[PDB]
Design a protein around this ligand. Structure first.
Ligand SMILES: CC[C@H](C)[C@@H]([C@@H](CC(=O)N1CCC[C@H]1[C@H](OC)[C@@H](C)C(=O)N[C@H](C)[C@@H](O)c1ccccc1)OC)N(C)C(=O)[C@@H](NC(=O)[C@@H](NC)C(C)C)C(C)C
Ligand SMILES: Nc1nc2c(ncn2[C@@H]2O[C@H](COP(=O)(O)OP(=O)(O)OP(=O)(O)O)[C@@H](O)[C@H]2O)c(=O)[nH]1
Ligand SMILES: Nc1nc2c(ncn2[C@@H]2O[C@H](COP(=O)(O)OP(=O)(O)O)[C@@H](O)[C@H]2O)c(=O)[nH]1
Ligand SMILES: [Ca+2]
Ligand SMILES: [Mg+2]
Ligand SMILES: [Mg+2]
Lengths: 69, 440, 424
């Protein structure tokens, strides 16, 4: 009976600890995934804007090429 | 011992907190500078009101509370208002940019910048306690901070305090006073995320409160001030067993034992009476029998739903004021005759009753009559799931076209989180169906 | 604490820009010298959204004035409220844009853009918490349309997480006879669909029609048109400028109004429309096609989202009843798969000269009529490759014209797809 009593309270501790552990890990996973997704969305936006800048350089390059002819 | 820490999150949570703490001060005789002449032990004590108020050496009684919002203008009114001396400045926490009605900004983009500071401040409160019982968390379903930051906070509290109890007061949206089209998304997201972290959640349907103000108090177009004064009376009813003691008092934890038969089935329906204007209450004695009968009138519920179309798993009556045992017992007897209150076959049918002798208080300038006795019924009924079904339907209409979803994805969320959240709600609705079915 | 930076570009942009500042300065009790002389604290509560505070309690518009020629800005400077603006915030060239979007976007505008950006950064750096930018400009000219859209791109690059809002004046043959206008507009719209979060479509076609038909002005002036514009801009920024619950900042507005990122073009409306009311009447009129600042019939489409703003001392009970009535009686014209898609705000402070007014902001699929009208005009010239040398001579390629047209037609298709969608 005493061994059983010890087992019950260690079980209660273990399940509480495991709850905390899994909550902790779920949250770290979610936060890392969110961080990476948001950063990727910004990176893509900037990438498109930078392609506009390049395009604009070509337009002016094109105008300069046309000009002397 | 038995301390309770309140956490008020976002505009709705903060403004309801204003109303509750003002009301608590009036109930306990605490002045707006925090002095309490009736309290003879200076700088500490273990009276019942000490579950909610700490004390300084200088005689100040200070709410065990943190207010947090992601923009400053609502908490700034607290900082400069009537009860500004009541709170230590470190209890009032603000950021600069709010969640813009976006769960994702509240939980991630913006919330992540202030969560550590918030936990630090909660920890300072926790350190002052000699037997912390748990947290009471006040927030809207609909706002970006009330939804997203609350979820983040609840997850972090589970990690930092383990299974220390956490109760919610959650403001469920209504179109009459709602401020964002995406409130159903925020509602479903936060209910999913918080479900395994909360021990008990009292939903407050803004439409139910709005209706009661219009119908019972003859308020033409209720404001948040009207709504919050009513809400604070209901919250006060529920927390009264923690803040007062008496021979007939039954602790909130005892009601909770009866109210939660399975971990997920933890959403009591609250019903409050009497809600009556001064004009109508004059020369009118509302008996124990009358206010008890009113608990079974759906018009007085805090959430719109129909318990007569559902089954009960528990019924608790929380009385305050001039209320004696013989009258309660006679009132319940009558009700059990006249009303068909149908319980599931696996629960006993006896109502659990607490009585606090201190009568209800009203705040000056309010519309509620001051009455000799009041009652709040807390019931566990399958009908509460109606409220989920209404929100889930609105979610489904928008999500089918992915309307507004890009606002969430742009802040780093994935569509999988939406479908995962909605599936959890589908499972919750199914859980409420299943507990209502007869045993084999 | 949540600052907006205002930019006005080109002739139209500066004209309606200046009027906007005149109008809201008066509403906030700011005089032409920047001194406050008002009656109510509600005027100053959120003053910092649009104004900087200087020494001696002066308020200075967080406004940047841009053009490729100096005439309009000279006009503004010696205007009534000319002295209120920060002198260093005037940024102008000398050579003009010649109603050429390519000059504004790639050539002349590109040579001036960096000095505009220097002023933008200065204004943004001093912000406690910047919410975003609002630009006034026309789509038909060259500076406002071309350099305006260039500025949007450049600003977005350095402030990618801030809201970008425009007041974009659409061209109409009735107001102007400049032939290249549908080119400039189509090239502009191509930029706006990709790079702004919310755009108010101010249609010169609608403005002319209101002036001529409703206000019965035989020969409407630009001044007459801008009177409508300034009333409108005042109306749709009320919730940003006065204490309030609903759509109180640029991002909350966008989250309520934009269900899909490309569909961010709004039809504004205003009531009453008068030149020499009950709540039911205000409400009727604001949903009336005659009161729209974009030349589209909302009964030819469906509403995705609506913001309604009422101003003046009135019964909120009545406003609520009437807004419910309009939605119930016209339910077919609101998409059923966005529940509760109409939001209403009431601000106690009426505009100058009125007891009460109502301002309407609609995201309606009927806005495709505006884009179809432009597209028709565009394609008539482009099919015959007319007047293209103006643009190719600045280095542009034909394919960019094709892409612009293609994007705009896609935008029209998408409005139609959601107009046609059902819940079941
Ligand atoms: C319908 C197109 C605009 C609206 C009118 C208006 C221009 C105007 O108002 N103009 C031309 C700058 C001067 C201004 C007015 O002049 C009377 C001043 C008082 C003004 O409105 N001032 C306002 C307060 C000021 O903020 C301001 C705004 C914009 C520009 C300049 C100044 O004049 C009738 N115009 C060109 C016309 O009506 C002309 N019509 C046409 O050109 C027609 N084709 C022959 C089509 C294009 C409309 C006729 C004069 C032949
Ligand atoms: N009963 C009550 N409801 C409120 C109050 N304030 C806001 N609400 C409701 O709460 C929801 C909006 O969420 P808020 O709490 O304002 O938003 P927030 O938590 O501050 O989040 P963000 O502003 O998005 O950062 C809507 O359903 C409102 O009707 C209040 O004082 N009392
Ligand atoms: N409503 C209005 N439209 C204008 C005004 N000024 C110019 N426009 C319109 O703007 C277009 C021409 O662009 P404009 O601003 O004059 O050229 P920019 O200076 O190169 O930007 C035409 O369609 C005009 O009808 C104005 O003050 N009010
Ligand atoms: Ca004491
Ligand atoms: Mg808020
Ligand atoms: Mg011009």
């Amino acid at each position: 009976k005493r061994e059983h009593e010890r087992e019950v309270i260690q079980k209660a501790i273990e399940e509480n600890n495991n709850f905390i552990k899994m909550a902790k890990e779920k949250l770290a996973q979610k936060m890392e995934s969110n961080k990476e997704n948001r950063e990727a969305h910004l990176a893509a936006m900037l990438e498109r804007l930078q392609e506009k800048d390049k395009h604009a350089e070509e337009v002016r390059k094109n105008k300069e090429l046309k000009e002397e002819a | 011992m038995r301390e309770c820490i309140s956490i008020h999150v976002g505009q709705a949570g903060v403004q309801i907190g204003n109303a509750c703490w003002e009301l608590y001060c009036l109930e306990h005789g605490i002045q707006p500078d925090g002095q309490m002449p009736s309290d003879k032990t200076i700088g500490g004590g273990d009276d019942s009101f000490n579950t909610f108020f700490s004390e300084t050496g200088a005689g100040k009684h200070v709410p065990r509370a943190v207010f947090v919002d992601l923009e400053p203008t609502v908490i700034d009114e607290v900082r400069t208002g009537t009860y500004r001396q009541l709170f230590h400045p470190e209890q009032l926490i603000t950021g600069k940019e709010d969640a813009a009605n976006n769960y994702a900004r509240g939980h991630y983009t913006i919330g992540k910048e202030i969560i550590d500071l918030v936990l630090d401040r909660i920890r300072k409160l926790a350190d002052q306690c000699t037997g912390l019982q748990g947290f009471l968390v006040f927030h809207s379903f609909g706002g970006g901070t009330g939804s997203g930051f609350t979820s983040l906070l609840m997850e972090r509290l589970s990690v930092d305090y383990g299974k220390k109890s956490k109760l919610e007061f959650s403001i469920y949206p209504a179109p009459q006073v709602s401020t964002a089209v995406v409130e159903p998304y925020n509602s479903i997201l936060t209910t999913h995320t918080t479900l395994e972290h909360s021990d008990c959640a009292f939903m407050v349907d803004n439409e139910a409160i709005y209706d009661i103000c219009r119908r019972n108090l003859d308020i033409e177009r209720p404001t948040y001030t009207n709504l919050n004064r009513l809400i604070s009376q209901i919250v006060s009813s529920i927390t009264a067993s923690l803040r007062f003691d008496g021979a007939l008092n039954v602790d909130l934890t005892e009601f909770q034992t009866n109210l939660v038969p399975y971990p997920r089935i933890h959403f009591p329906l609250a019903t409050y009476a009497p809600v009556i204007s001064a004009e109508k209450a004059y020369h009118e004695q509302l008996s124990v029998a009358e206010i008890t009968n009113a608990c079974f009138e759906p018009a007085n519920q805090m959430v719109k739903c129909d318990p007569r179309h559902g089954k009960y798993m528990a019924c608790c009556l929380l009385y305050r004021g001039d209320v004696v045992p013989k009258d309660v017992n006679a009132a319940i007897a009558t009700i059990k005759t006249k009303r068909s209150i149908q319980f599931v076959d696996w629960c006993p049918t006896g109502f659990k009753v607490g009585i606090n002798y201190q009568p209800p208080t009203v705040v000056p300038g309010g519309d509620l009559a001051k009455v000799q006795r009041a009652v709040c019924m807390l019931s566990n009924t399958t009908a509460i799931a109606e409220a989920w079904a209404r929100l889930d339907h609105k979610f489904d209409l928008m999500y089918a076209k992915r309307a507004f979803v890009h606002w969430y994805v742009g802040e780093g969320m994935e569509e999988g989180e939406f479908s995962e959240a909605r599936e959890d709600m589908a499972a919750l609705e199914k859980d409420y169906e299943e507990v209502g079915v007869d045993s084999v | 604490m949540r600052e907006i930076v205002h930019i006005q570009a080109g002739q139209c942009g500066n004209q309606i820009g200046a009027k906007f500042w005149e109008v809201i300065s008066d509403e906030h009790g700011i005089d032409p010298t920047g001194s406050y002389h008002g009656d109510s604290d509600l005027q100053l509560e959120r003053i910092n959204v649009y104004y900087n505070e200087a020494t001696g309690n002066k308020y200075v518009p967080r406004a940047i004035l841009v053009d490729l020629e100096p005439g309009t800005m000279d006009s503004v400077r010696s205007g009534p409220f000319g002295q209120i603006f920060r002198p260093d915030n005037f940024v102008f060239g000398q050579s003009g844009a010649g109603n050429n979007w390519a000059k504004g976007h790639y050539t002349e505008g590109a040579e001036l853009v960096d000095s505009v950006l220097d002023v933008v950064r200065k204004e943004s750096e001093s912000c406690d918490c910047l919410q975003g930018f609002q630009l006034t400009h026309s789509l038909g000219g060259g500076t406002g349309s071309g350099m305006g859209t260039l500025l949007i791109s450049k600003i977005r690059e350095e402030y990618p997480d801030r809201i970008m809002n425009t007041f974009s004046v659409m061209p109409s043959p009735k107001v102007s006879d400049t032939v290249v206008e549908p080119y400039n507009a189509t090239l502009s719209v191509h930029q706006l669909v990709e790079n702004t979060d919310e755009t108010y479509c101010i249609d010169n076609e609608a403005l002319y029609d209101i002036c001529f038909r409703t206000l019965k002005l035989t020969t409407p002036t630009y001044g007459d048109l801008n009177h409508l514009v300034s009333a409108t801009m005042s109306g749709v920024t009320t919730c940003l400028r006065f204490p309030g619950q609903l759509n109180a900042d640029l991002r909350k507005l966008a989250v309520n109004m934009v269900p899909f990122p490309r569909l961010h073009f709004f039809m504004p409306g205003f009531a009453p429309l008068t030149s020499r009311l009950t709540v039911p009447e205000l409400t009727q009129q604001m949903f009336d096609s005659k009161n729209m600042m974009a030349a589209c019939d909302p009964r030819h489409g469906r509403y995705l989202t609506v913001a309604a703003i009422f101003r003046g001392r009135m019964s909120m009970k009545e406003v609520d009843e009437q807004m419910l009535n309009v939605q119930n009686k016209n339910s077919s014209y609101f998409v059923e798969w966005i529940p509760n898609n109409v939001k209403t705000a009431v601000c106690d402070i009426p505009p100058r000269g009125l007891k009460m007014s109502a301002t309407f902001i609609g995201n309606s699929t009927a806005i495709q009529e505006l884009f179809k009208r432009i597209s028709e005009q565009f394609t008539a010239m482009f099919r015959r490759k007319a007047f293209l040398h103006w643009y190719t001579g600045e280095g542009m390629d034909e394919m960019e014209f094709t892409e612009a047209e293609s994007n705009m037609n896609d935008l029209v298709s998408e409005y139609q797809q959601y107009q046609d969608a059902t819940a079941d």
